[PDB]
């Protein structure tokens, strides 16, 4: 009915909701450790290597080793930095990263210590935009870190972060529109419930693709990776940062990856609902199994991140902004129309017309985008004219 | 009228942050500090909106003002300076005192005009938000205020047109492409072939150091003309 | 209060974690003053004499300023879709047509910007 | 807490924003102060909407946000145009029209 | 579903659709054809609008107006009268805006006679600007912007809700902010004018919205009729109502140009393009005073005893400071701006009347004065120095009439209309407003306005002295026609100014019929 369901949310006792908050925080910490370790090992495998397999049994302690080493490493405060904002920027990056995850549905209702509570820290009438707002706040961490370092390379990194925001944020926002249309709510729990019949990834594929591209953009991950851009700006924004300040920038990056992958899972992959091979199994969607399914989907998205990093080079941030504004935003807006018209027609019994329009629309878009990829980006040009340098004779 | 003590504490802390943020926006000597304080004020006001049973409004505030303050910070770097510290010395004789007096008087008079209002009754918004705050906002926007909603499109078009007319530069001044610059009698590489690097000395290797010509004089071309 | 105090608790946990992490950075591990260490990283080259010109005491032009200005308005405008999207079923055909007209107006603006080279530069 | 406090805060914020427009030469800071003024108006609208048990004030706050964004963009365009010629973003620099 | 009165909204709908279509022309029309379509689209679009208005007027011969969009818009007789006035003034202003260079050997005439720089983003005097001028390029995006301004202004009198009124204020303000900075000549002054106008307009609009918030808190409603019901029934706070009325008055007074808020008008009118200044000084004044009329005759009549004393002072100041400051002015455009301030004061005297005679007098005053101001500024735009810049230095106008008797006589007619001499629409106009004020118990305002008019006649007459009684200087300016559109605008404006002076009962019956707002 109404989402968030008042019979489930807003009733956890102080101790239980504190326990859920601590559990979510610890889950994010463990997931960040695992994300780093598994990413390094998977990059190794995709590059025929083994990755960390010596620091602890099978390298399990490598991520913890790196974290504690950064803790045990000198905390630099370079001269010429805007010290207050320079020290705050890591905190500004971190806090929203954790906050955003508060409205992620990790599972359905479950009974713990005699209380029926959602396997979810909380839910809001506007939860998805709450996540978007938290992530948007988080980018000020990157930008102010770049600016406050008082050096050229961090400044360029922060400027690239701002450009990346301009590139991806509107597309991210427009991606949620179709999800809301089909779910009829902004609550994450309501969106998950709306996907009981089918996952929105099948229904809202263009929205899913735009959102995924915007996810990779938001997390400053390859092939976008612009604010860091190791090969270009040395360290990008987090240059001039060392020890746990850099550690916290990277922690915020990975927590953002996890949060936005979980948001993708919630909005498109049916949240915590069991996949088809397990959906037929009784009790799979109940109890603590939804946690397993949600983690599996989130980690498939993490695998997508790692695979993109291993396979693709990084775009120029002008090219990323061109992708955002000439492809992503127009595609998402056309899809928003198409979806609205389709749903309105279906609600009025038009039937076949919608089934036509939708297909035609996508048939057009994939062609038109192809043009931008092949026609607009012409691969021919005229020869240059000679000059005083007495050029040789060409073949 | 009274609000929940939790809401009272939320208001006190968050509105203290918002007031301090506005004061910083007005008083910060670095424009970037002003932008950061504006972001703080906007986020605090969003939290207050949430506290006042306007969740959608607060969240949208956070999102759009995060974007807008980011853009304003970009324009601060572009037009004022990366870390320029403004003087804030009154350039108009007696204007500072007069402005402070006028501001204080206006604020005092506005507060006096407001007086006690909630004493006249304070309806709980729970009745309206019942059925969804966003649902109610949608019902009002597209039924009672669809005209203003549509006119916001005219506002957007006017903003875009102004940007395109005043800020967008055109062909007569488009920067030369790397291909264009390379092809200028082969200017880029053969016309003063890549300029001599800044001189490298023991105790000095920065880009501001000119190179030494054979006669012992500093080569002008070694150091970029902009550098002091 | 409910439905938000969990967010407040998680935010408190995260803020304590982050501030304590900064404190640990500053307080755990060796600390040794060194002027070369503290000065700005410049790929190993000496930082420019402090002064101020053509950078920190100057401005860094962004060549996508136009797209930033457009981003402001477009971001603030699209948020109309969210209440429309959520209440779509309840509003009915009239609201669908109204939002389609609004979206077509936004499309006219976008097309004018795009076709007149507004999305050029960075 | 008495809800009317929210209005006083707005009255302060608006006031501060007004003072900012008088005190700061930078055009961008002037835009920030105008945004402060409009958001103080939004806070007053939200408080009154809560007071009257209806969402109309919230809708007005939304529309004020739209107006603030559009006005900021137009002001930024004007300031770009001025700066490209004068290489300055100070309001006091545009002093030619006088007396 | 919400019933939409498209017929009633046909005005402002033609205009906004035409503005959108003009933006489409900018987007996807070849350069060489952009201006012919835009001017064809703009002018025709306004002509249609005018027709729509009269049709709506006929529709209103029955019920005394009606809401259109479930509130938020009301087309009553005052609203339709003001919308027709604004449509006509917009037609004339666009005819001014579309004027190109008179002629040249090269075909690249670039809408310059209308003072519009070929590329506003180009640096003033830069090689890019010179090259753009030589190539004959010109930013036709001006025409859509104007439409939007007209659109917003057309809505501003008709807005029946605070939110819609605020949105219309912004919609008309932003295009004007942009247009004030597009002057072809003296680009530095035009950019300064645009910046000043933007800053002060944003300031005033912030005050406007804060006042709307105060009013909403007092009455718990945004509809003007609802606020009237709240204040009359005493259910409101009655302090927030007054504070909101004051803060809203701040915005509307800024738009009309009262002395506490007039300072922007001189600089903006001097710096802005002459055609844009001519169009704006009429249309914006008309729209702002229409909104003020709706506020003070629909929204808050009950608090007349509370806000009437304030307006008095404003009006008084506006009549005194507006006129006295004009006495020593040496610039024609700046002097006309101060005249606009003083005439805002004269309008406010009639608005204070708080009687149907006040509404009729204000409507007629706005019509006649919008026409007169548009014509005066159009004529000012034709006086060109040797360098080609609009010769506004009043001393340089010496002997101008002795060289151009037709234009000199037309400008003298406009000046005497501003001074309020009988046999000019300006006198009938001033008499209407002062009569309304006297009937409304404000005869002290009538006396003060009479003294202010006596003062202002001096600086209105000094121009005629220089034009006709003085010999031309050696380097005296010359007229640039420059095309049929400008001549048509000047002729129509002078003809209206003379006819409404000699034979005012036409359109005065129309103003009388528009004495009643829909409550």
From Swiss-Prot, chain A:
UniProt cross-references to InterPro entries, sorted A to Z: NADH_UbQ_OxRdtase_su1/FPO, NADH_UbQ_OxRdtase_su1_CS
Q: Does the keyword Transmembrane helix apply?
A: yes
In its UniProt record, a GO molecular function of this protein is: oxidoreductase activity, acting on NAD(P)H, quinone or similar compound as acceptor
Specify one Pfam family.
Answer: NADHdh
The alphabetical list of record keywords is: Cell membrane, Membrane, NAD, Quinone, Translocase, Transmembrane, Transmembrane helix
Q: Where primarily located?
A: membrane
Location comes to:
Cell membrane
User: Which reaction equation describes what this protein catalyses?
Assistant: a quinone + NADH + 5 H(+)(in) = a quinol + NAD(+) + 4 H(+)(out)
Q: How does it sit in the membrane?
A: Multi-pass membrane protein
Listed PROSITE patterns: COMPLEX1_ND1_1, COMPLEX1_ND1_2
Principal EC category: translocase
Question: What EC number(s) are associated with this protein in UniProt?
Answer: 7.1.1.-
One of the protein's GO biological processes: aerobic respiration
Provide the transmembrane region boundaries: 18-38, 84-104, 124-144, 165-185, 198-218, 261-281, 288-308, 321-341, 353-373
Please give the GO cellular component terms listed in this UniProt entry. plasma membrane
Stretches with biased composition (Pro residues): 382-395
Its annotated function is as follows: NDH-1 shuttles electrons from NADH, via FMN and iron-sulfur (Fe-S) centers, to quinones in the respiratory chain. The immediate electron acceptor for the enzyme in this species is believed to be menaquinone. Couples the redox reaction to proton translocation (for every two electrons transferred, four hydrogen ions are translocated across the cytoplasmic membrane), and thus conserves the redox energy in a proton gradient. This subunit may bind ubiquinone.
Quaternary structure?
A: NDH-1 is composed of 14 different subunits. Subunits NuoA, H, J, K, L, M, N constitute the membrane sector of the complex.
Q: Which NCBIfam families match?
A: PRK06076.1-2, PRK06076.1-4
Name the record gives this protein = NADH-quinone oxidoreductase subunit H
Organism, per UniProt? Mycolicibacterium smegmatis (strain ATCC 700084 / mc(2)155) (Mycobacterium smegmatis)
Curated annotation (Swiss-Prot), chain D:
Known Gene3D superfamilies for this protein? 1.10.287.3510
The protein's annotated catalytic reaction(s) are: a quinone + NADH + 5 H(+)(in) = a quinol + NAD(+) + 4 H(+)(out)
Its top-level enzyme class, in one word, is: translocase
What one GO molecular function would you report for this record? Answer: NADH:ubiquinone reductase (non-electrogenic) activity
What GO biological process terms does the UniProt entry carry, in alphabetical order? Answer: ATP synthesis coupled electron transport
InterPro entries registered for this protein in UniProt: NADH_UbQ_OxRdtase_chain4L/K, NUOK/Mnh_C1-like
Residues passing through the membrane, by range: 3-23, 28-48, 59-79
Instruction: Kindly list the places in or outside the cell where this protein is found, as annotated in its UniProt entry.
Output: Cell membrane
The secretion signal range is none
* Keyword list, A-Z: Cell membrane, Membrane, NAD, Quinone, Translocase, Transmembrane, Transmembrane helix, Transport
Describe its membrane topology: Multi-pass membrane protein
What family does the entry list?
Belongs to the complex I subunit 4L family.
Subunit info here reads:
NDH-1 is composed of 14 different subunits. Subunits NuoA, H, J, K, L, M, N constitute the membrane sector of the complex.
Q: What does this protein do?
A: NDH-1 shuttles electrons from NADH, via FMN and iron-sulfur (Fe-S) centers, to quinones in the respiratory chain. The immediate electron acceptor for the enzyme in this species is believed to be a menaquinone. Couples the redox reaction to proton translocation (for every two electrons transferred, four hydrogen ions are translocated across the cytoplasmic membrane), and thus conserves the redox energy in a proton gradient.
Q: Which NCBIfam families match?
A: PRK05715.1-2, PRK05715.1-3
Stated name of the protein: NADH-quinone oxidoreductase subunit K
Source organism of the structure: Mycolicibacterium smegmatis (strain ATCC 700084 / mc(2)155)
Native organism taxonomy: Bacteria, Bacillati, Actinomycetota, Actinomycetes, Mycobacteriales
